[PDB]
Amino acid sequence: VDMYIERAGDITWEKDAEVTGNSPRLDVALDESGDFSLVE
């Protein structure tokens, strides 16, 4: 299986960016497999 990379852009902040999304505060645990789960 050939995995390969292609350049897609510069790493730059864009002044004209779409703004969206919430800012939830969540309790989580991170297990040994790198999986986040919610906690209560």
Binding site: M3, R7, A8, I11, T12, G21, N22, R25, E32, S37
Partner: protein, 148 residues
């Protein structure tokens, strides 16, 4: 080798993720490549460091990205979705609260092949990578940053 954001492709061809070239090191998420070597032109990039718990891997050298969210300011996801031009999405992160401290998180839901896309602070520095997270039915990604 050139600095930038990159698609990670497999073989028809499919985009399985994204990563960041900086200071001669390619940075992406473990779940994207599982550490496999990557072709870049006629060259090969070999893994150098990886960690399943952090869900991160670096190629050609140690992890170089060390900026962190300031906890107050909006950030931008430099999303590189499959089949789409790199685009910036600005957002105020929420927070993953964990026993070992708080982590920024972005409540943005892009296709799986966007995993590894960089999240940027206002100065243009990569503060982490997108694509390891939790579901609340909306996905929320940690801002995953390694250690330099």
């Amino acid at each position: 080798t050139t600095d930038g954001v990159y698609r990670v492709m497999t073989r028809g061809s499919t985009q399985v993720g994204v990563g960041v070239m900086q200071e001669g090191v390619f940075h992406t998420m473990w779940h994207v490549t599982k550490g496999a070597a990557l072709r870049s032109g006629e060259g090969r990039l070999d893994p150098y460091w990886g960690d399943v718990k952090q869900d991160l891997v670096s190629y050609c050298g140690p992890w170089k990205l060390d900026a962190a969210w300031d906890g107050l300011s909006e950030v931008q996801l430099l999303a590189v979705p499959p089949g789409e031009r790199a685009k910036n999405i600005q957002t105020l992160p929420g927070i993953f609260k964990t026993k070992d401290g708080d982590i920024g998180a972005v409540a943005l839901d892009y296709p799986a092949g966007t995993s590894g896309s960089p999240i940027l602070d206002k100065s243009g520095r990569v503060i982490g990578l997108y694509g390891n997270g939790v579901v609340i039915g909306s996905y929320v990604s940690a801002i995953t940053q390694g250690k330099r």
